[PDB]
Design a protein around this ligand. Structure first.
Ligand SMILES: CCCCCCCCCCCCO[C@@H]1O[C@H](CO)[C@@H](O[C@H]2O[C@H](CO)[C@@H](O)[C@H](O)[C@H]2O)[C@H](O)[C@H]1O
Ligand SMILES: CCCCCCCCCCCCO[C@@H]1O[C@H](CO)[C@@H](O[C@H]2O[C@H](CO)[C@@H](O)[C@H](O)[C@H]2O)[C@H](O)[C@H]1O
Ligand SMILES: CCCCCCCCCCCCO[C@@H]1O[C@H](CO)[C@@H](O[C@H]2O[C@H](CO)[C@@H](O)[C@H](O)[C@H]2O)[C@H](O)[C@H]1O
Ligand SMILES: CCCCCCCCCCCCO[C@@H]1O[C@H](CO)[C@@H](O[C@H]2O[C@H](CO)[C@@H](O)[C@H](O)[C@H]2O)[C@H](O)[C@H]1O
Ligand SMILES: CCCCCCCCCCCCCCCC(=O)O
Ligand SMILES: CCCCCCCCCCCCCCCC(=O)O
Ligand SMILES: CCCCCCCCCCCCCCCC(=O)O
Ligand SMILES: CCCCCCCCCCCCCCCC(=O)O
Ligand SMILES: CCCCCCCCCCCCCCCC(=O)O
Ligand SMILES: CCCCCCCCCCCCCCCC(=O)O
Ligand SMILES: CCCCCCCCCCCCCCCC(=O)O
Ligand SMILES: CCCCCCCCCCCCCCCC(=O)O
Ligand SMILES: CCCCCCCCCCCCCCCC(=O)O
Ligand SMILES: CCCCCCCCCCCCCCCC(=O)O
Ligand SMILES: CCCCCCCCCCCCCCCC(=O)O
Ligand SMILES: CCCCCCCCCCCCCCCC(=O)O
Ligand SMILES: CCCCCCCCCCCCCCCC(=O)O
Ligand SMILES: CCCCCCCCCCCCCCCC(=O)O
Ligand SMILES: CCCCCCCCCCCCCCCC(=O)O
Ligand SMILES: CCCCCCCCCCCCCCCC(=O)O
Ligand SMILES: CCCCCCCCCCCCCCCC(=O)O
Ligand SMILES: CCCCCCCCCCCCCCCC(=O)O
Ligand SMILES: CCCCCCCCCCCCCCCC(=O)O
Ligand SMILES: CCCCCCCCCCCCCCCC(=O)O
Ligand SMILES: CCCCCCCCCCCCCCCC(=O)O
Ligand SMILES: CCCCCCCCCCCCCCCC(=O)O
Ligand SMILES: CCCCCCCCCCCCCCCC(=O)O
Ligand SMILES: CCCCCCCCCCCCCCCC(=O)O
Ligand SMILES: CCCCCCCCCCCCCCCC(=O)O
Ligand SMILES: CCCCCCCCCCCCCCCC(=O)O
Ligand SMILES: CCCCCCCCCCCCCCCC(=O)O
Ligand code: NI
Ligand code: NI
Ligand code: NI
Ligand code: NI
Ligand code: NI
Ligand code: NI
Ligand code: NI
Lengths: 155, 155, 155
């Protein structure tokens, strides 16, 4: 409720990549709705021609991974480096766009961009992990050394 | 780890709408479990009578959009205006409750609240985008003017 | 953009539980891909032998609840108590790991860890709610008393 400082400028690139991700997900959704018309599939019900089922499944898989992407983007961006996390996020999202486009054409064409999206997501995971390790490991190593010291009142 | 200030009071309405959203999602889930009994559908397996499939599909669609709603709510609430973002969030969630209730009765009755939920989500997206533009565009325009200036050492 | 303080040390346990949750979700996904080979189910398409359908459905359900878990973890951790929220989060995630493992073996074996995951999630919801109530209820009670006072200019 103010606050004479804000932390917006520390997360704005994460927020922009997040919004791009929302926009891409919305687009995937609109493509499924468009495929429902092209290939005559009525709600509820997610079975129909192969071409429809591939578009449907591409959207479902993107949707499933999307919170994982968001969680890791934010943890990596806060604990490791904002710019690095955001760049990796852009690469992931572009890879997901290529995955969806590929998959819609052929199951097999989903594979190369799928691998690219996994490499970008795993890099985000590794940056998040390194950032958290940097945060916790020094204090933990110190507390353990201190307990050891201890010895003491001797030597 | 303290900190003689906190930023809770800047995000509390976003946090409350978020929690309401979790509660609504939990409710949708409990309704699917209840429909599984009413219409005799046993896990795993998500096919059964039309009435079950509509309830199932309403929950699935709400679930799919729920991270999009959360992401945009937080970005809009931080970059644009907390109160506005929270209000739009409440409207979205009420619209989703009406969507789920409608859909359970008839595919066709899902449509009006579906359109209401999309208008509320797109307004959140537009507030998020405007907030981010307000954040990045002045510094970007300035850096570009400065490079232009440049000219200079003349005129 | 600096900032001579950071709020990382107030959310690091939430961030670590979040990352563990991402890792567990990634694992569930890899298990579905592994079941697709074991039980010969090719993409798109999520129907096959019972053993495959159980593994698939366990992943889907974990995926569906995962944003709910994340949202509530963060709200509870910020508004109620970071350590308590993180502990409950670990219990939820362990319960989800046991749920997935159970379900893969038998529908019936998913049930005990399912109930454990629901108790942990509902405790997170209750901590989030109590934290938000603590935040809003005093100011609200005060504003209402002040309007009452009022009376006044008399008595
Ligand atoms: C540690 C985390 C690692 C994260 C990366 C996960 C995805 O990693 C991916 O794995 C599969 C293995 O089936 C490889 O899959 C593919 O490799 C080459 C591409 O050079 C293909 O021609 C080949 O058809 C296929 O085997 C990808 O080259 C790799 O990028
Ligand atoms: C840089 C890019 C950003 C540009 C910003 C512009 C964004 C505008 C995108 C348009 C989004 C439209 O939003 C979409 O509307 C259609 C209606 O037409 C809805 O569609 C709904 O109604 C139709 C027709 O009754 C049904 O057949 C359909 O099954 C149902 O889902 C979608 O559920 C909603 O998601
Ligand atoms: C730019 C982003 C726009 C976001 C809004 C997306 C949803 O927008 C929605 O689109 C569909 C078009 O099929 C309209 O759909 C409906 O309009 C009217 C309602 O007045 C109905 O009687 C009619 O059956 C149908 O065409 C909705 O009126 C509109 O609200
Ligand atoms: C208020 C929010 C409550 C959150 C907890 C939700 C889950 O709560 C769960 O409910 C179901 C009721 O079908 C119970 O379900 C089970 O109870 C016992 C376990 O002691 C079983 O032997 C029995 O087969 C079954 O009825 C679980 O014991 C309970 O933990
Ligand atoms: C970043 C937070 C900026 C504060 C915005 C306050 C808006 C109040 C307008 C009513
Ligand atoms: C190689 C991939 C090149 C992609 C070219 C087609 C772009 C499709 C438009 C997608 C709109 C995304 C919305 C954000
Ligand atoms: C789903 C995960 C959401 C996580 C959001 C956590 C935000 C809490 C901390 C905000 C303070 C900003 C820290 C600045 C670090 C940086 O430079 O990026
Ligand atoms: C160095 C990192 C550069 C940041 C890229 C983020 C841009 C987001 C664009 C939407
Ligand atoms: C090309 C369309 C851009 C949308 C996907 C965002 C990633 C851009 C790199
Ligand atoms: C490409 C990066 C390699 C992925 C390593 C993942 C490390 C996270 C382990 C916690
Ligand atoms: C999983 C993520 C990998 C990073 C290591 C996380 C650190 C664990 C937190 C230690 C708890 C400290 C309690 C005092
Ligand atoms: C601050 C982020 C730096 C990450 C690199 C850390 C590597 C392990 C450090 C202990
Ligand atoms: C007990 C949990 C306390 C959390 C703080 C972690 C210490 C490492 C810095
Ligand atoms: C907002 C953060 C408030 C600090 C709560 C600290 C609780 C420590 C209790 C052990
Ligand atoms: C018009 C819509 C009116 C809705 C009336 C029924 C309410 C159903 C209860 C939903 C409980 C939501 C849990 C939060
Ligand atoms: C999934 C997106 C989660 C985003 C959470 C980002 C929170 C980081 C910044 C917190 C500082 C609070 C900023 C105050 C602005 C306001 O008035 O709402
Ligand atoms: C002006 C905005 C008012 C805020 C509404 C948010 C209330 C959330 C209720 C749960
Ligand atoms: C009516 C039940 C309220 C639950 C949905 C929240 C939106 C309220 C407006
Ligand atoms: C109703 C609002 C209209 C939606 C416009 C979407 C703008 C976001 C584009 C980035
Ligand atoms: C998509 C969201 C629309 C808002 C515009 C985002 C701004 C892009 C970030 C620019 C990167 C700055 C690098 C210095
Ligand atoms: C601070 C939020 C204000 C949003 C309105 C901005 C419009 C474009 C500004 C540049
Ligand atoms: C290079 C990326 C730096 C991010 C900061 C964006 C500048 C706009 C304020
Ligand atoms: C917590 C935020 C710490 C600031 C990290 C700044 C990194 C800049 C390196 C270029
Ligand atoms: C009782 C449950 C004991 C579980 C023993 C098997 C562990 C499976 C490994 C899961 C890896 C999780 C990745 C984080
Ligand atoms: C999906 C929900 C994401 C929510 C992320 C909200 C983070 C905004 C506030 C960050 C300031 C840190 C507050 C410290 C309280 C604490 O001790 O945990
Ligand atoms: C008292 C709470 C202890 C914190 C447990 C969080 C550890 C996360 C491990 C990953
Ligand atoms: C056992 C494998 C650990 C993964 C799940 C995390 C919860 C640990 C308690
Ligand atoms: C076990 C905890 C009981 C769950 C109570 C849920 C309260 C949230 C209501 C808002
Ligand atoms: C649902 C969560 C339960 C906690 C109560 C939320 C408080 C509602 C916000 C009140 C809006 C204040 C407007 C001034
Ligand atoms: C600060 C968190 C404390 C939560 C307990 C609050 C109980 C209701 C208080 C009003
Ligand atoms: C009008 C909405 C203002 C939000 C602030 C809530 C007041 C309770 C503290
Ligand atoms: Ni002041
Ligand atoms: Ni201040
Ligand atoms: Ni102090
Ligand atoms: Ni301080
Ligand atoms: Ni300085
Ligand atoms: Ni400062
Ligand atoms: Ni601060």
């Amino acid at each position: 409720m103010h606050h004479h400082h804000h932390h917006k400028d520390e997360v704005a690139l994460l927020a922009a990549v997040t919004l791009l991700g929302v926009l891409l997900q919305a687009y995937f959704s609109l493509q499924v709705i468009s495929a429902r018309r092209a290939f005559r599939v009525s709600p509820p019900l997610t079975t129909g021609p192969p071409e429809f089922e591939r578009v449907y499944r591409a959207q479902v898989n993107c949707s499933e991974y999307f919170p994982l992407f968001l969680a890791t983007l934010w943890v990596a961006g806060i604990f490791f480096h904002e710019g690095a996390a955001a760049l990796c996020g852009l690469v992931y999202l572009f890879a997901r766009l290529r995955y969806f486009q590929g998959y819609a054409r052929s199951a097999q064409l989903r594979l190369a961009p799928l691998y690219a999206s996994a490499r970008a997501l795993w890099l985000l995971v590794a940056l998040a992990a390194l950032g958290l390790l940097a945060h916790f490991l020094p204090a933990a190593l110190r507390a353990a050394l201190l307990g050891r010291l201890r010895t003491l009142l001797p030597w």
